[PDB]
Amino acid sequence: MRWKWIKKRIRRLKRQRKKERG
Amino acid sequence: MARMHARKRGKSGSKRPPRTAPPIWVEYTVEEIENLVVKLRKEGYSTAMIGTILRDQYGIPSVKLFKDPDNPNRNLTITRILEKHGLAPEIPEDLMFLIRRAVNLRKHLEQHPKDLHSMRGLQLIESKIRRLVKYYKRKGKLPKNWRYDPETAKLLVR
């Protein structure tokens, strides 16, 4: 679980933060 | 009884004599006592150790009980015997010993700086000084214009 979520949250964050940074 | 300060460890239970007036099987005059004190402060010993040697040699456990009454404003004891003569350090010994030590630390750290623990007691001794300063100001052994710092600790010792 919290492994999952942390990396899902991180990937969401990055990918989206990539989309914001871009 | 205890206070585990910067520790978890219960303090020593050392306890006073419950004597309230002094032994008479021990015998000294107000004049004789006063001499003994002045001689020892002349050596370079300090008031705790002055009270220590008098205890171990001359058999007087605390001065207050023996002396007062001889001017019953308050109890007459070592440094109050000293101040009337002018032998008293204007800095209280409490605050002095403290600062004294402190300046020695700094020199170690000077040469050795990779020291957690030694760094961490610098922080632990200053902050006792600070306090000891703070209240004295208000009581009045140290002027209100003062403030504590590590250059104003290296000036008081020298």
Binding site: - | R16, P17, P18, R19, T20
Partner: protein, 129 residues
């Protein structure tokens, strides 16, 4: 440190009570406690006490009859009007009978019942019942 030395007296005295020892020793001692035990004895709750004043401290050795149920100090020690007494009457005490809500007063120190008979009040100090 300590504060509320009284309270740390009282609280012993009660936890003392609840065990059913014979007599108590309270290492810190005072007027507050002295006086309060005095008033306490006056109502009768306790037997006899001696304090010995050591050059250290007063100590009270107290004799326990069995009477006391619960007797406690007040936390911020509120001021209480003589009109508000009845409120503080219903709350703290167990019923109309008992009446040692010990307050401190202009006249001195009293219980609740000794306060009411005079007619005077103030800040609360402790309770006993």
């Amino acid at each position: 440190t300590l504060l509320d030395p009284l309270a740390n007296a009282l609280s012993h005295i009660t936890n003392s009570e609840r065990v059913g020892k014979r007599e108590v020793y309270i290492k810190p001692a005072s007027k507050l406690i002295g006086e309060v035990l005095r008033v306490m004895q006056k109502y009768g709750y306790i037997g006899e006490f001696e304090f010995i004043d050591d050059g250290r401290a007063g100590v009270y050795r107290v004799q326990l009859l069995g009477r006391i149920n619960k007797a406690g100090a007040i936390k911020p020690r509120f001021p209480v009007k003589v009109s508000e007494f009845e409120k503080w009457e219903k709350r703290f005490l167990p019923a109309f009978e008992f009446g040692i809500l010990i307050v401190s007063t202009s006249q001195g120190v009293m219980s609740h019942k000794e306060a009411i008979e005079k007619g005077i009040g103030g800040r609360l100090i402790a309770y006993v019942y």
